[PDB]
Amino acid sequence: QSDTHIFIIMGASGDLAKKKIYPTIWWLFRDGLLPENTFIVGYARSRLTVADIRKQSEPFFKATPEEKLKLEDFFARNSYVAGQYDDAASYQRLNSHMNALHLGSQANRLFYLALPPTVYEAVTKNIHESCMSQIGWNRIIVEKPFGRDLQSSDRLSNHISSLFREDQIYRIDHYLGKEMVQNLMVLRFANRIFGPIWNRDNIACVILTFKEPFGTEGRGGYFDEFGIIRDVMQNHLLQMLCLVAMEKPASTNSDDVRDEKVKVLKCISEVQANNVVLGQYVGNPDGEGEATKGYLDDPTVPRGSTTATFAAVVLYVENERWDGVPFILRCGKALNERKAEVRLQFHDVAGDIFHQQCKRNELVIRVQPNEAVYTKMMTKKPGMFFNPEESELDLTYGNRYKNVKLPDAYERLILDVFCGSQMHFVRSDELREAWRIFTPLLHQIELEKPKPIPYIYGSRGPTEADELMKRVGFQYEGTYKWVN
Amino acid sequence: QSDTHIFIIMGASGDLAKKKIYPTIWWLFRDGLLPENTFIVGYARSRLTVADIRKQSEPFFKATPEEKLKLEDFFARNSYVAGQYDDAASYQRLNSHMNALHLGSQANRLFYLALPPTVYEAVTKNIHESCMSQIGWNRIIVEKPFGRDLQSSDRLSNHISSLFREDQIYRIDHYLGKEMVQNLMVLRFANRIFGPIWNRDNIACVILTFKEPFGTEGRGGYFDEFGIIRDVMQNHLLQMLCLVAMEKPASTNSDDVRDEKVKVLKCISEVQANNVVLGQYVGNPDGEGEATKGYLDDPTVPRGSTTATFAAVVLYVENERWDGVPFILRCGKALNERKAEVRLQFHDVAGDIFHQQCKRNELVIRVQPNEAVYTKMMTKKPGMFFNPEESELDLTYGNRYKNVKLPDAYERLILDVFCGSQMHFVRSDELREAWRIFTPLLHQIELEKPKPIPYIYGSRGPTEADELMKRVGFQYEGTYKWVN
Ligand SMILES: NC(=O)c1ccc[n+]([C@@H]2O[C@H](COP(=O)([O-])OP(=O)(O)OC[C@H]3O[C@@H](n4cnc5c(N)ncnc54)[C@H](OP(=O)(O)O)[C@@H]3O)[C@@H](O)[C@H]2O)c1
Ligand SMILES: NC(=O)c1ccc[n+]([C@@H]2O[C@H](COP(=O)([O-])OP(=O)(O)OC[C@H]3O[C@@H](n4cnc5c(N)ncnc54)[C@H](OP(=O)(O)O)[C@@H]3O)[C@@H](O)[C@H]2O)c1
């Protein structure tokens, strides 16, 4: 558009703004993806100047000697306004400043809330009362945490919704912005090969995985407040579940897609402790650097802490497509690898004519690292053999899509907020559903404080997780050898 | 087994025996696949000796300096008997010779008929009356041609069946012996991912392909007698159709599999000339060697010959699984490439939510060259794109199964004849069905002698073939770019 656009970084002083948001909008700017008439305004308490932000931020850019773009053009379109987060005059200074930009009164306004959540109500209120364009649209971008249980999430959401329409709320889950997570819809609904099999007649279980090989790395005090399931499971993994489980939406329109995701969530009952295994990492006596230290060997972590760093959990979607099909959600810190992944384990072929030599098919979408889709499969053993054996059909983006830059999540999503696309952004009802499922578990843990199961830095986590997966009907072999 | 085995090469003097069969049984011998107590007897008119066969044949072996195996051991187990193909005494000499081998009277007998078909009745009769073990099994291996129309195929089959049980008849189609052709059953019936889609609700058409880039190469007189459809279409391609179309058999047992193949064939009506395009190659004025010469520029080919070197033909299987689904059979000589292939083109996804940007899925099993299975597919365009585009999931045996020797068809099949496995061998009823489908077409051509459509050496054949495929509902794009 020819419309002017104002991207306000609320909290421009802090680390997220310095190392993520300023770089991200830079890169968007750099690549000709923003509107031409775009201005960046930072707002934080410190008495900063555009020079002080350039010095903070441009070591985090792709600083290249082609920097006319960077040359003030990007920074010339930057300004800064100092201000307190619940001082009304401050927001008049801000609004007034925005107004004095080129067509500032007309411009579309996009407020990035790069702030801690203890200030989200104040900032939000103040924006509403004093800083809203009266002509252009007004969009707010909010980061996790969105509450820490139902009731607290409800507080925040009822506040925001009183001030802003759903039209205006862009809650980011950086997961919706990943290449492979966006691909799920295309994989499923642009292809007949998948789809007729995408149901309980064919699938024995869905595994949704998120693994990190690093522990907590000095920041354990921060993590200890919420733990792994609040961290990763109620947001990222449950999102993947939704995209997997979704009925086909009426259209790609943002709210036809999101009302399929909530629809699924509504068929999932509160998770019971029968279906949970919790883990906390201890260090490896035979390890290297950080890997020697357990969760409790952070001096930032309170002594006797019970917080879990690993959780496997089994959910069920009580509907026609999925009745009975366990959805295993599996995540953790200080594990054997970095990986996030969707796997379908299909049922045994009916009426076996090979002689218990078949192995269940699997469909694997590996979100990270090394973006790949493959199906684990049966072929006839190459050569003089009459036997089936395990093989696969592969799409690996590394090799096929060799010269294709994949954007970072924040590049994609922030672009979506300019283009007005809420598809990849957690809706209010979605967020309620998410909290409903996990809240009574969460409180059970807070109350009764169960000892999580010990596992070694770099292991696959507690063995009890595997027994849970096996008990709901996952089958692990030993037999699938991959090469290349 | 410890049982003695006698492999008789009827026609040991000729080129097939010299360059295929002697080498093939050698290689089997060499690799420890035959029984220990195996003897090879050659039978032909010429007054030859084992020395004369060694000199003929061992340039066609993998002559390696590890040749104890070759050292007479292989040749020490060779003998030769001269004889006429309908002289009774000759078959007494032969039978008597077999008898004087170690446990020759007990031994299992396996007669390879490496002879021209003008002698198949004589040889067969003579074997039956004078050369059958009375203790061990007796198996005959017969090569195409099996007749040239129904009535002629019936003659031969009624002859053979009067003498031999079906138990005893191993009609070779070297196609059933290829790696990928054997794989079809495993691909289909060892995997849930395929299979629920393996039907008319999901498939728009099946393409069965067999292409050669060489013309006729001086041997056109031989080819001119039968033409392309007798050559390739009624055997190899119709076999692939059967393996594709087959209901799931009750067991891998040889005759539960073959009675699925005939079952399909029985739902296919005689092909009409509406559904046929015929081609004959002319040479390329802008070509290289042989490729400059048209079919008629062989002096071996009779002037004004009408024989077709290319044929596309559309068949239908009138049953529950396949009603309406065209099965396009496409083959030819002097084409753009060597290839044999199975392709399923799936229907459009129902209720499109992308915007006519989807392309039909395809499942490709490439039998030769470069044994591969892949599915052509839709993924989201990598990067900042919301669009689907064409991609694929690949199994390429070249890369995955890098160090795996694939045997030649004749190695596999002849081994099957020792192990007593008829699965990969054309049954009598099958062969009747095959002739029924094509015979009235064949005779129509013999009678009315239509001018085949000209196409250039190295082209994809006549463009009218593409119009036929498009008219029955194949859709070709232009858009699928593969790399690697
Ligand atoms: N080009 C490519 O991208 C490509 C294609 C095909 C295969 N590969 C590689 O080949 C390897 C094997 O493939 P795969 O992971 O799909 O097959 P796999 O080894 O069969 O993994 C199956 C799953 O079993 C789980 N599991 C449950 N109970 C288990 C137990 N008791 N013991 C062990 N594992 C148990 C594993 O958890 P974990 O997640 O904790 O292991 C894993 O998710 C991987 O490293 C993969 O990256 C790469
Ligand atoms: N690793 C691997 O093995 C691997 C994997 C994927 C792709 N590839 C390669 O990628 C290339 C493209 O793949 P593909 O052949 O499956 O896709 P394609 O180019 O879409 O071929 C589709 C089919 O369209 C037929 N056709 C019908 N009407 C046509 C018309 N008017 N113009 C052109 N073609 C028409 C072609 O006949 P023809 O058979 O005469 O061409 C062919 O069978 C191939 O060379 C393939 O070997 C290799």
Whole-angstrom Cα distance, residue B125 to residue B111? 13
Q: Is A451 exposed, middle or buried (0-12, 13-18, 19+ CB in 10 A)?
A: exposed
Q: Looking at the partner chain, which of A250, A379, A384 has a beta carbon nearest the beta carbon of B183?
A: A379
Cα distances (angstroms) measured from residue A116 to each of A7, A154, A426, B381: 19, 18, 18, 35
d(C-alpha B252, C-alpha B255), whole Å: 8
Strand A138-143 and strand A108-113: the pairing is parallel
Domain ranges of chain A: 5-143, 176-408+422-471
- Strand spans (E) along B316-464: 327-332, 339-346, 362-368, 372-380, 388-396, 453-456
Cis peptide before A369 (omega within 30 of 0): yes
Highest CATH level, class, for A5-143: alpha beta
**Nearest by Cα to A171 from A179, A185, A161, A162:** A161
Q: What is the DSSP letter of B402?
A: T
What is the token pair recorded at B313? 């033909």
Give contacts of B378 with chain A, Cβ < 8 Å: 186-187, 190-191
B366 a known binding residue?
yes
Measure A169 CA to ligand 2 centroid, in angstroms. 47
Q: Which CATH class is domain A176-408+422-471?
A: alpha beta
Resolution of the experimental model in angstroms, please? 2.5
Strand partners, A203: A346
Catalytic residue selected from A97, A236, A347, A424: A236
Strand bridging mode A339-346 / A203-211: antiparallel
Q: Which residues, 6+ apart, have CB-to-CB distance to A258 below 8 Å?
A: A422, A423, A427, A430
- Among all residues of B, which ones are annotated catalytic? 236
Q: Do B190 and A392 touch (CB under 8 A)?
A: no
CA distance B115 to B270: 31
A57: Cβ–Cβ under 8 A, 6 or more apart, which residues?
A17, A18, A19, A22, A23, A26
Do the beta carbons of residue B406 and residue B397 sit within 8 Å? yes
| Dist CA B265 CA B261 (whole Å) | 6
* Sign of CA pseudo-dihedral A29, A30, A35, A38: positive
Secondary structure element (H or E) that encloses residue A266, with its range: helix A254-266
- Residue B391 CB–ligand 2 contact under 6 Å: no
Helices and strands, counts by H and E, chain A = 16, 15
Atom index in ligand 1 nearest the CA of residue A461 equals 40
Residue B366, Cα to own-chain centre: how many angstroms?
Answer: 14
Ligand 1 pocket check for A464: Cβ under 6 Å: no
| Chain-chain contact of A349 with B411 (C-beta, under 8 angstroms) | no
Find out whether A145 and A129 touch, Cβ atoms under 8 Å. Answer: no
Cβ-count burial of B414 within 10 angstroms (0-12 exposed, 13-18 middle, 19+ buried)? buried
Please state whether beta strands B362-368 and B276-282 pair in parallel, antiparallel, or not at all (unpaired). Answer: unpaired
What's the topology of domain B176-407+427-471? Dihydrodipicolinate Reductase; domain 2 (3.30.360)
CA of residue B100 relative to chain centroid, distance: 37
- Return d(Cα A9, Cα A79) in angstroms, integer: 10
Probe target for ligand 2 pocket from B460, B467, B468, B474, with the most ligand atoms within 8 Å of CB: B460
Is residue A40 a contact partner of residue A79, using CB atoms and an 8 Å limit? yes
Provide the shortest C-alpha distance from residue A189 to chain B (in Å). Answer: 8
Q: Retrieve residue A403's tokens.
A: 């010269």
Give A304 to chain B, closest Cα distance, Å: 46
Q: In angstroms, what is the span from residue B301 Cα to ligand 1's centroid?
A: 60
Cα B406 from Cα B178, distance rounded (Å) = 9
Name B311's Cβ contacts closer than 8 Å, sequence gap at least 6.
B227, B228, B229, B233, B276, B277, B278, B279, B329, B330, B331, B332
As given in the structure block, the two tokens for residue A57 are: 């931020």
What are the angstrom distances between the C-alpha of B268 and each of B242, B261, B272, B343, B472? 11, 11, 12, 19, 16
Is there an atom of ligand 2 within 6 Å of B396 CB?
yes
Residues A132 and A8 sit within 8 Å (Cβ to Cβ): no
The first and second tokens of residue A252, run together, are: 């790609």
The Cα A259–Cα A265 span in angstroms is 10
Q: Which residues of A touch B243 (CB under 8 A)?
A: none
| CA dist list (Å): B208 to A358, B181, B211, B431, B478 | 28, 12, 10, 19, 20
Instruction: Pinpoint the alpha helices (H) of A396-427.
Output: 397-400, 409-419
Ligand 2, atom 9: closest residue by C-alpha: B482
Assign residue B375 a region: left if phi > 0, alpha if psi is -120 to 50, beta otherwise?
Answer: beta
Paired with B138 in beta bridges are B109
Known catalytic residue at A443: no
Q: Whose CA is closest to B342, among B482, B235, B210?
A: B210
Burial grade of A472 (CB within 10 A; 0-12, 13-18, 19 or more)? middle
Q: Is the dihedral of CA A452, A455, A461, A467 positive or negative?
A: negative
Candidates B378, B475, B482: best to mutate against A (most CBs of A within 10 A) is B378
In this structure, the strands spanning A38-44 and A5-10 are: parallel
Q: How far is CA A456 from CA A240, A285, A478, B183, in A?
A: 27, 9, 22, 44
